[PDB]
Amino acid sequence: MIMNLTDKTVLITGGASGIGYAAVQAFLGQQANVVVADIDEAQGEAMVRKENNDRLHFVQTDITDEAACQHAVESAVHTFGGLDVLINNAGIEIVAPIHEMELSDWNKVLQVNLTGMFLMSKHALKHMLAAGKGNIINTCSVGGLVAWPDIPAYNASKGGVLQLTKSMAVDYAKHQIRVNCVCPGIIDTPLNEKSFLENNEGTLEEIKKEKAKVNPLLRLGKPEEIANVMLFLASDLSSYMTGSAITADGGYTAQ
Amino acid sequence: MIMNLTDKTVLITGGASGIGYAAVQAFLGQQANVVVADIDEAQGEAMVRKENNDRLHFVQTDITDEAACQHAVESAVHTFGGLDVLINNAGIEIVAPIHEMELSDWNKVLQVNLTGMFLMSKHALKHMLAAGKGNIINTCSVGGLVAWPDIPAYNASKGGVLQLTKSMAVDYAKHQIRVNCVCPGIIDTPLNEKSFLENNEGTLEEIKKEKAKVNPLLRLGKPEEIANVMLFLASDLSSYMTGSAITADGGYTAQ
Ligand SMILES: NC(=O)C1=CN([C@@H]2O[C@H](COP(=O)(O)OP(=O)(O)OC[C@H]3O[C@@H](n4cnc5c(N)ncnc54)[C@H](O)[C@@H]3O)[C@@H](O)[C@H]2O)C=CC1
Numbered sequence: 355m356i357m358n359l360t361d362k363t364v365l366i367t368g369g370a371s372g373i374g375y376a377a378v379q380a381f382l383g384q385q386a387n388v389v390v391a392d393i394d395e396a397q398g399e400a401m402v403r404k405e406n407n408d409r410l411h412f413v414q415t416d417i418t419d420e421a422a423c424q425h426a427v428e429s430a431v432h433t434f435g436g437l438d439v440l441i442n443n444a445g446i447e448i449v450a451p452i453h454e455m456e457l458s459d460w461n462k463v464l465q466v467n468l469t470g471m472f473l474m475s476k477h478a479l480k481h482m483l484a485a486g487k488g489n490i491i492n493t494c495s496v497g498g499l500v501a502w503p504d505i506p507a508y509n510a511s512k513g514g515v516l517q518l519t520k521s522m523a524v525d526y527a528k529h530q531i532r533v534n535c536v537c538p539g540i541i542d543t544p545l546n547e548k549s550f551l552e553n554n555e556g557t558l559e560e561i562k563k564e565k566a567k568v569n570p571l572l573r574l575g576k577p578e579e580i581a582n583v584m585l586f587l588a589s590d591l592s593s594y595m596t597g598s599a600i601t602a603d604g605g606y607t608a609q
Numbered sequence: 610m611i612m613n614l615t616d617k618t619v620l621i622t623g624g625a626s627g628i629g630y631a632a633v634q635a636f637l638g639q640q641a642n643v644v645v646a647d648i649d650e651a652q653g654e655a656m657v658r659k660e661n662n663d664r665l666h667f668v669q670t671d672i673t674d675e676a677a678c679q680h681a682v683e684s685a686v687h688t689f690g691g692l693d694v695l696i697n698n699a700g701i702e703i704v705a706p707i708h709e710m711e712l713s714d715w716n717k718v719l720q721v722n723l724t725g726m727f728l729m730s731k732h733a734l735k736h737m738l739a740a741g742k743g744n745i746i747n748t749c750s751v752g753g754l755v756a757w758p759d760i761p762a763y764n765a766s767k768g769g770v771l772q773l774t775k776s777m778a779v780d781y782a783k784h785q786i787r788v789n790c791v792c793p794g795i796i797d798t799p800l801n802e803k804s805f806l807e808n809n810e811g812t813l814e815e816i817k818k819e820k821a822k823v824n825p826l827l828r829l830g831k832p833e834e835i836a837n838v839m840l841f842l843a844s845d846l847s848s849y850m851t852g853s854a855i856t857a858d859g860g861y862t863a864q
């Protein structure tokens with residue numbers, strides 16, 4: 355009744371898995387039209403078949419390429435007639451210390467996490483300015499607020515996301531375009547589980563237990579728990595919020 | 610459908626006016642049982658008559674007195690059978706510079722804004738520990754993050770609220786008691802209109818226009834826009850959030 359997301363068009367980058375996919379489900383569940391922009395064509399089409407929903411559309415998109423970003427925005431406008439909410443959720447992680455990291459690896463992290471956010475936002479904003487309203491939601495991280503160990507390029511990129519979020523909030527408030535971010539803690543997603551095994555010793559379950567011990571709530575976050583923050587930020591419930599960060603980390607940054 | 614506040618018992622301090630009252634309305638609208646603890650008996654009873662709702666109960670309460678805080682918690686348990694959410698919303702403002710401020714005035718601000726929050730939380734937590742779950746929501750302020758001019762005691766008190774919020778989050782996460790705060794910007798309430806006239810030159814409407822201009826969104830917040838943040842923090846939607854602050858200030862702290 356109060357979410358009021360019915361007939362709103364929501365473009366979600368990295369929507370084919372993890373937090374992005376949980377966001378797809380949550381928004382479809384609120385009667386929003388959802389457009390997923392993701393680089394993984396196979397996983398994207400699989401998603402379309404599983405969800406089997408009129409309100410869902412997939413468009414293959416590499417956000418590091420500007421033409422593809424524009425095309426993703428145009429796909430939303432063609433398919434559902436507009437674009438109310440952009441969720442810049444795609445991101446990658448590469449583990450490497452600064453003193454050993456390859457420039458090409460640094461750039462791969464920054465290009466997806468930050469440059470792609472810029473490019474998607476650029477073209478979404480062109481449309482939202484013309485339409486007279488809009489909403490942008492960025493997937494930041496605890497890593498944008500404090501440093502996760504051993505992932506400096508990631509942390510840096512998310513620091514960029516935090517300030518880009520605030521910048522766009524301040525520059526576009528006069529045009530009624532709200533811009534906020536969510537800062538997730540450690541979320542239990544398949545992709546993350548791969549990172550757990552690569553960078554810690556022990557079985558998957560043992561590593562999960564260790565990670566779920568670093569949070570005051572004593573558990574890892576679920577993708578849907580971040581998706582729910584995105585619902586709030588997209589809805590009119592958060593109408594006086596712009597340029598802000600919502601932390602969802604089980605108490606991690608509180609200590 | 611997803612808020613899931615039906616049959617949850619919510620105790621709101623300062624609930625008889627402004628943000629507190631808007632919170633009463635929002636929570637009643639979500640089928641929560643609401644208990645208002647407020648010092649103003651007349652205004653409290655007036656509220657009860659206007660709302661005319663079985664789910665609303667008023668209990669006169671001076672939160673600076675510990676016995677009254679305990680009694681407010683007990684009133685919730687007796688009336689509705691439990692206590693799921695405490696919203697520490699009551700607060701006052703006194704305008705005075707540090708070099709001129711009377712100790713008695715300093716203490717009046719701290720006692721309501723901070724001590725009362727402690728006392729209400731103390732007794733709510735005793736019950737929530739026994740019940741095995743709970744939620745505390747504190748009304749902080751932009752003043753807890755940066756300094757509003759000319760209200761140092763208020764700012765100090767809200768700095769206390771921010772850290773008390775984080776402290777309780779960290780200490781009670783293991784018992785599944787989530788603790789968060791909302792940091793409102795400038796909200797258009799009747800009592801804030803009195804403050805506008807007392808501390809600025811011009812008509813009410815002229816002063817409102819000036820205050821609206823200092824936010825990137827170019828308007829004052831509405832009480833219900835803060836109440837809506839409280840709904841989110843009370844609901845299961847925010848289940849992975851604890852020890853966090855949600856800023857709702859029209860972009861004020863983003864610049
Ligand atoms: N612990 C956690 O899980 C946290 C995650 N986040 C952020 O959440 C976001 C998503 O998280 P997860 O669900 O774990 O990620 P994920 O790895 O599960 O999924 C990300 C999606 O982004 C896509 N993607 C990658 N590069 C792309 C490109 N150039 N163009 C388009 N799509 C691309 C992938 O295909 C994938 O579907 C990321 O920004 C991540 O950094 C933030 C803090 C914590």
Ligand SMILES: NC(=O)C1=CN([C@@H]2O[C@H](COP(=O)(O)OP(=O)(O)OC[C@H]3O[C@@H](n4cnc5c(N)ncnc54)[C@H](O)[C@@H]3O)[C@@H](O)[C@H]2O)C=CC1
Pocket residue numbers: 622623624625626627628629646647648649670671672673698699700701721725748749750751752792793794795796797798799800801
């Ligand atoms: N309006 C604004 O711009 C901002 C407001 N806030 C905070 O929001 C909260 C509510 O704000 P408003 O709704 O404007 O306040 P308000 O003045 O409209 O209402 C506060 C309520 O608390 C009650 N109260 C006062 N002393 C009390 C005591 N000892 N015991 C019990 N109740 C008592 C009052 O009687 C009243 O019903 C406060 O904590 C305030 O500091 C924070 C930042 C900005």
